[model samples]
Target: ASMGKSKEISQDLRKKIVDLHKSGSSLGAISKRLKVPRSSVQTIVRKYKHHGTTQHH
Candidate 1:
């Protein structure tokens, strides 16, 4: 957890992740294309798909 506290992914960004994920793009692929960390994108996709929202803290 060197990243320390995690940042909550914005709803807009969540939408983008969902779209890209469904558009036949892997998490790594989308992250590369969007210039974001794959871990961040993966967290968003996983949280959204399961809870329809991201965990805020």
Candidate 2:
């Protein structure tokens, strides 16, 4: 398998993930609906819930 270039998720998308989560959507559902990776969705949710933001240092 070819390793693809890593893509950065925009802040807007992160906010959308958070919003979807707040609306009672599962991580898998959010990922499926937005075509994002489930792991990315989980990380964004975890970061926002813990630190109130999804800024990776």
Candidate 3:
């Protein structure tokens, strides 16, 4: 399979992910709704929650 760009989604998108979480959305659901890959959403949520970082390259 071809790899995704993985060039780092925008900070706005990161914020949106956090917002979605705060809005009671599951990571999978947020990924599905946002149309971003689930892994990417997981990375964002994990890093933000644990390390205060948004999964960036």
Candidate 4:
């Protein structure tokens, strides 16, 4: 079977990550709970703090 391209994270998930962070969750914990990479969790939180939103450009 051919591999498809990676999918982008949904806005819902991005919001979830931000909410979790705001609720006092750690990046590692959020990544583990969401089954996503720690880097992604970190980036999302960082973006939210810096840009006030998680929408990618």
Q: Estimate the TM-score of every prediction.
A: 0.47, 0.53, 0.53, 0.53
lDDT accuracy of residue 50 in candidate 4: 78
* Higher-ranked by TM-score: 1 or 4: 4
Q: On a 0 to 100 scale, what is the lDDT of residue 15 in model 4?
A: 80
Off by over 4 Å in 3: 1-8, 25-33, 52-57
- The count of backbone overlaps in candidate 1 is 0
lDDT of each: 0.69, 0.73, 0.73, 0.73
lDDT of 1 by residue, 1-57 (tens): 366766664767777777777777475676676787768766766777776555465
Name every residue pair that clashes in candidate 1. Answer: none
lDDT of 1 at 42: 66
| Model 3, TM vs. native | 0.53
Error of 2 at 12 (Å): 0.6
Clashing pairs in 3: none
Candidate 1: list runs displaced more than 4 Å: 1-9, 25-33, 52-57
Q: Per-residue lDDT tens digits of candidate 4, residues 1-57?
A: 897888766879888777877777475676676688768766876778877655467
**C-alpha RMSD for every candidate:** 8.3, 7.6, 8.1, 6.2
Alpha carbon deviation, residue 51, candidate 2 (Å): 2.1
